C-alpha cells in the first residue's frame, strides 16, 4: 500500500523535473530547434502532465478517498489524453523522420512553421478526443445497470473505467496500430539509409577500383569498359543532392568523356593520362561531397536509432500492462502483485525519456 505511494512519488518527481529540464535544454540550445525537437517538447509537456497527475491519483486511490464518479472518470480520462498524446507525438516524430529521409529537400519547404503548429494542434486534438471518449457516454453508466446510479464512490480503476474500451479501443486501435505503423516506418528508414550508405559506398568503390584498373592496363578494350563503369557511377552519384555539388560532377563526367574520346581512337596512353585528371576532380570535389553526405546519413541513422529506443521503451512499458488488461476482459484472474508492477512499468516510461536523451544526444548532457 505504501510501496506504491513512494514509488509513484519517485516516478512523478523524476518525470516532472527531468522533462522540464528537457524543455529548458531544448529552449536554451539554439541548434535543437527543429520540428522533431518541437514534437519532443510536446512529448515532454505530456510527460510533465503525467507526473503532475500521477502524484495525487496514486495515494487518492490507495487511501480510497471518496470522490465523485465523474471526477474519478475525469482523472483517469485525463491520464489517457496525456498517454495518447505521447503516442501521437511519437507518431509525429516518426512521420517527420520518414519524410526527412524520403524527401531530402521537398519536406523542408513543404512543412512550414505554421503547418508544424497546425500538425501539433491536430495531434493534441486527436489525443483529447480519443482519451475523453469514456467521458462521452462510454463509461460504466452506458451498459452496466449497477454502475449506472452509483455516486460518490471510492475511486478505483475497475469501478470507473470500461476495460472493454481499454482492450479494444485504447490498445488495438490507438496503441497497437500506431506502434505497428511506427515500427514499419523505422524499419523502412533503417532500410533506406543502409541502401543509401551502400550505393554511395558502391559508387565510391567503383570510382576507386576503376581508377586502379586504368593504371594497370595494356589495351583500350579494358579501358573503355572501365570508364563505362565510372560514367554510370558518376551519373548515379550526381543524383544524391547548393549548385557546387552537381557542378563538380559535370567536370568529372566531362573528363570521362574526354578520355572516352581518346580510348575510342586507340590511344591507350592518352586515355590513361586523361584519367589521371579525374583524381584532381576526385580530391577537390568527391572527397568533400561524399564525406559530407556519408556523415549526414550516419547522423540521420544515429538519430533514428536514438528515437527508436524511445519507441522500444514505450513498447516495453505499455504492452505488458495491455496483456494484463487483456486477461481482465477475457474473464481471467490477475494477481495483485503482478498488476501493481504493470502500472508502475506503465508510468516508468515517464522517467525513461530524459535519460535516453542524455545518453544518445550529446547536446543534452552538456546542458
Amino acid at each position: 500500500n505504501v510501496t506504491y505511494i513512494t514509488m509513484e512519488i519517485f516516478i512523478g518527481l523524476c518525470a516532472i523535473v527531468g522533462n522540464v529540464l528537457v524543455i529548458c535544454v531544448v529552449k536554451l540550445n539554439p541548434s535543437l530547434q527543429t520540428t522533431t525537437f518541437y514534437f519532443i517538447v510536446s512529448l515532454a509537456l505530456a510527460d510533465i502532465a503525467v507526473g503532475v497527475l500521477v502524484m495525487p491519483l496514486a495515494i487518492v486511490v490507495s487511501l480510497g478517498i471518496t470522490i465523485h464518479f465523474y471526477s474519478c472518470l475525469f482523472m483517469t480520462c485525463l491520464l489517457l489524453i496525456f498517454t495518447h498524446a505521447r503516442i501521437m507525438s511519437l507518431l509525429a516524430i516518426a512521420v517527420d523522420r520518414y519524410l526527412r529521409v524520403k524527401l531530402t529537400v521537398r519536406y523542408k519547404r513543404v512543412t512550414t512553421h505554421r503547418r508544424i503548429w497546425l500538425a501539433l494542434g491536430l495531434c493534441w486534438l486527436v489525443s483529447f478526443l480519443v482519451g475523453l471518449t469514456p467521458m462521452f457516454g462510454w463509461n460504466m453508466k452506458l451498459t452496466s445497470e449497477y454502475h449506472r446510479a452509483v455516486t460518490f464512490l471510492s475511486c478505483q480503476f475497475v469501478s470507473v473505467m470500461r476495460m472493454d474500451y481499454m482492450v479494444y479501443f485504447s490498445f488495438l486501435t490507438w496503441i497497437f496500430i500506431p506502434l505497428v505503423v511506427m515500427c514499419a516506418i523505422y524499419l523502412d528508414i533503417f532500410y533506406i539509409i543502409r541502401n543509401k550508405l551502400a550505393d554511395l559506398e558502391d559508387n565510391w568503390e567503383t570510382l576507386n577500383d576503376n581508377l586502379k584498373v586504368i593504371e594497370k592496363a595494356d589495351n583500350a578494350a579494358q579501358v573503355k569498359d572501365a570508364l563505362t563503369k565510372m560514367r554510370a557511377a558518376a551519373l548515379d552519384a550526381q543524383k544524391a543532392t547548393m549548385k557546387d555539388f552537381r557542378h563538380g560532377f559535370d567536370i568529372l563526367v566531362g573528363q570521362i568523356d574526354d578520355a572516352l574520346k581518346l580510348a575510342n581512337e586507340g590511344k591507350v596512353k592518352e586515355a590513361q593520362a586523361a584519367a589521371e585528371q579525374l583524381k584532381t576532380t576526385r580530391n577537390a570535389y568527391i572527397q568533400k561531397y561524399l564525406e559530407r553526405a556519408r556523415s549526414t546519413l550516419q547522423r540521420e541513422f544515429k538519430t533514428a536509432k536514438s528515437l527508436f529506443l524511445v519507441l522500444f521503451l514505450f513498447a516495453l512499458s505499455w504492452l505488458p500492462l495491455s496483456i494484463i488488461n487483456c486477461i481482465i476482459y477475457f474473464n481471467g484472474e490477475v494477481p495483485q502483485l503482478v498488476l501493481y508492477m504493470g502500472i508502475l512499468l506503465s508510468h516508468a516510461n515517464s522517467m525513461m525519456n530524459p535519460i535516453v536523451y542524455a545518453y544518445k544526444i550529446k547536446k543534452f548532457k552538456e546542458t
Partner: antibody, heavy 124, light 109 residues
Framework: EVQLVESGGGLVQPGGSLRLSCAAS????????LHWVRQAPGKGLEWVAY????????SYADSVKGRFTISADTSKNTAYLQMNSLRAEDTAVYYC?????????????????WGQGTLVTVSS | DIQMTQSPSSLSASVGDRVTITCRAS??????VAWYQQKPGKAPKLLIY???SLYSGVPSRFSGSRSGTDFTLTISSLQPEDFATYYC??????????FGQGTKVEIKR
C-alpha cells in the same frame, strides 16, 4: 521549326558506294551531336555512326567500322554519311537523329528529334 | 557491349488496358535509358528520357520507372494511337548506344 531531312539514299550495287546528306534546318550542327541509326526491314533499330562537329569526334559501330565514314559541314548545316563497300545486310532505312552536349538537359534528351529517314537498297 | 534485353516481344492489349514493357540492362547505365515509339512507316518519337521524365508533347498516360538495372515503360490508359512498336535505348555514351529488340503492341480480340 527544328527538323532533319535526309537525302542521297537510293539503289546501289553490293560493293558500291553511297553518300547520305542530313540537312539540319532549325538548329546548328556545332551545338548538337548528330547520329545515324538504321532500321533493317522487319528488324529493330541499330546505331551506326556519330559526328560531333564542335570537336571533330567520330565513332562507328563495329559492323560499319572501317567502311562507313561520317563528316559534317558547319556552313551547309549538313552531316554526311559516306558509305563504302556496301553489302546485303546494309539494306535499311537510315535515320538521322540529333543529341545534345554534356552537360545539362540537352544531353539527357537523347534523339529527341529524328529525321524522316531514307531507304538504302543494296542488291545485285 | 551493353545489351538491352526487352522482356516483351509480343504484347496484345485493347483500348483502356494498362501495359508494362520491361527492359533489362546488361550492366549499370545509371538513369540514361530512353523510350521511343515507332509507328510503321514513320520515324521513332521520343516518349521518356532519363527513365522517368516525360518528353514535351507526349501524353501523360506514358510513364517510366527504374529499379536498378531494370527499366519499365507503363501506359495506364491505352488509346488507339498507342498501337506501335516500342524501343528502349541506353545512352550512357555517344558511342555506346544500343537499342532494344522492340515491343509490338497489337490489338487484342
Amino acid at each position: 521549326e527544328v527538323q532533319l531531312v535526309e537525302s542521297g539514299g537510293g539503289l546501289v550495287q553490293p560493293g558500291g558506294s553511297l553518300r547520305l546528306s542530313c540537312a539540319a534546318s532549325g538548329f546548328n550542327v556545332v551545338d548538337f551531336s548528330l547520329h545515324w541509326v538504321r532500321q533493317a526491314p522487319g528488324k529493330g533499330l541499330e546505331w551506326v555512326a556519330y559526328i560531333s562537329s564542335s570537336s571533330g569526334s567520330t565513332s562507328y559501330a563495329d559492323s560499319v567500322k572501317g567502311r562507313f565514314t561520317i563528316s559534317a559541314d558547319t556552313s551547309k548545316n549538313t552531316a554526311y554519311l559516306q558509305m563504302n563497300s556496301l553489302r546485303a545486310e546494309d539494306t535499311a532505312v537510315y535515320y538521322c537523329a540529333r543529341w545534345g552536349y554534356w552537360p545539362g538537359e540537352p544531353w539527357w534528351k537523347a534523339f529527341d528529334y529524328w529525321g524522316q529517314g531514307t531507304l538504302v537498297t543494296v542488291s545485285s | 557491349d551493353i545489351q538491352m534485353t526487352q522482356s516483351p516481344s509480343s504484347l496484345s492489349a485493347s483500348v483502356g488496358d494498362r501495359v508494362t514493357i520491361t527492359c533489362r540492362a546488361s550492366q549499370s547505365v545509371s538513369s540514361a535509358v530512353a523510350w521511343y515509339q515507332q509507328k510503321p512507316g514513320k520515324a521513332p518519337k521520343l516518349l521518356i528520357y532519363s527513365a522517368s521524365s516525360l518528353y514535351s508533347g507526349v501524353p501523360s498516360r506514358f510513364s517510366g520507372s527504374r529499379s536498378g538495372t531494370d527499366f519499365t515503360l507503363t501506359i495506364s490508359s491505352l488509346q488507339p494511337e498507342d498501337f506501335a512498336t516500342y524501343y528502349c535505348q541506353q545512352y550512357l555514351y555517344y558511342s555506346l548506344v544500343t537499342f532494344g529488340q522492340g515491343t509490338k503492341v497489337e490489338i487484342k480480340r
